[PDB]
């Protein structure tokens, strides 16, 4: 409906886990999120953090407001629980694949609700905990979330990677496979 | 055992810079938006029956209305004219184009903003949706079915705001 759209003050909170998040977005990309534990603002692009200051306490203040509204809305609706949904994962690389070159593998996961998930990277059915960084829970128009995980890898000789996803709405985890060269 | 979620969304809509600005706040419970403020309307209007208490209660407080109406300037305009004009709007990332094979494929990656114009003068080509890498870069995959020894393909032309001249990589 417009040339640019900014999301300022997007707040999420869950009652059973006592878990929420506060983010800012512009034109569909994440500007930052507020680490509730460390009480600090983590900008998605560090260069933009040197130009713009957002004190984290503002984020924590919106979290506390939705934390309270959740207790109110949980009574207002007759304790309607969240409907677990089925996330649709997808795997693709950042730049064109070159055999023996460095590239980043992405596991796009869409239609996430509730925002509780476990995105794990496996190398030929081998647990990989190194070189993985995931974005926060980005938001969609139907009020479901999508979360992206990144894996830096050197493609060669059929490594057979796959991305495992654990969600309440999934009785069995969904694994998407990818290989090249 | 059971799970409950609440979401609040502050949304600023800019068209033609700051010429027209639209503020929309959304209070959401378990995927259901119940009350929203819209700067076109000027007050809180309930979206579902869940929102009726809030919309009636917040409209009775002239301060909530005053503060909320002011957020089109103190949040939408302020963030665009300052932080966004100094960061996201100025950001230009030139694309990386490269032609490979398997049907020839032209991969255009790592560019910003979204506006791009990838072309080969030959039609019969399938292009994917603009892929949003969540690292503030995009990529587009333009793929044409290729036959053998059909001369040397002219170019995979690429047009982008970051580029003053197209890349026009030859096959």
């Amino acid at each position: 409906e417009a040339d640019h759209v900014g999301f300022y003050g997007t707040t999420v909170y869950q009652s059973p886990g006592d878990i929420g998040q506060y983010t800012h977005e512009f034109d569909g990309d994440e500007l930052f999120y507020v680490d509730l534990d460390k009480k600090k603002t983590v900008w998605r692009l560090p260069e933009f953090g040197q130009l713009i200051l957002f004190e984290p306490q503002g984020g924590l203040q919106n979290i506390a407001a939705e934390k309270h509204n959740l207790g109110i809305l949980t009574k207002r609706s007759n304790f309607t629980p969240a409907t677990n949904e089925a996330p649709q994962a997808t795997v693709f690389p950042k730049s064109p694949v070159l055999l023996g070159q460095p590239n980043t593998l992405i596991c796009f996961v869409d239609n996430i609700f509730p925002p509780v998930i476990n995105i794990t990277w496996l190398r030929n059915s081998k647990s990989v905990t190194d070189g993985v960084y995931e974005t926060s829970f980005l938001v969609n128009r139907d009020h479901s979330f999508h979360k992206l995980s990144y894996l830096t890898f050197i493609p060669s000789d059929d490594d057979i990677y796959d991305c495992k996803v654990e969600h309440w709405g999934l009785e069995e985890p969904v694994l998407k496979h990818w290989t090249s060269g | 055992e059971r799970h409950f979620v609440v979401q609040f969304k502050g949304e600023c809509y800019y068209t033609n810079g700051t010429q027209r600005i639209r503020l929309v706040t959304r209070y959401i419970y378990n995927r259901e938006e119940y009350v929203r403020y819209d700067s076109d309307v000027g007050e809180y209007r309930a979206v579902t029956e869940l929102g009726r208490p809030d919309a009636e209660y917040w409209n009775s407080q002239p301060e909530i209305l005053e503060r909320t109406r002011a957020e089109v300037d103190t949040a939408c305009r302020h963030n665009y004219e300052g932080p966004e004009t100094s960061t996201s709007l100025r950001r230009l990332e030139q694309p990386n184009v490269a032609i490979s094979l398997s049907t020839l494929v032209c991969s255009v990656t790592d560019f910003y903003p979204a506006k791009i114009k990838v072309r080969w003068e030959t039609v019969g080509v399938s292009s994917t949706q603009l892929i949003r890498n969540g690292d503030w870069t995009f990529q587009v995959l333009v793929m044409l079915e290729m036959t053998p020894h059909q001369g040397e393909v002219y170019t995979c032309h690429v047009e982008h705001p970051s580029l003053k001249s197209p890349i026009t990589v030859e096959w």
Binding site: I72 | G10, T74
Partner: peptide, 12 residues
């Protein structure tokens, strides 16, 4: 950076 504030819901 400016923010939009969250109202407290009607309570009863």
């Amino acid at each position: 950076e400016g923010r939009v504030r969250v109202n407290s819901a009607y309570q009863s």
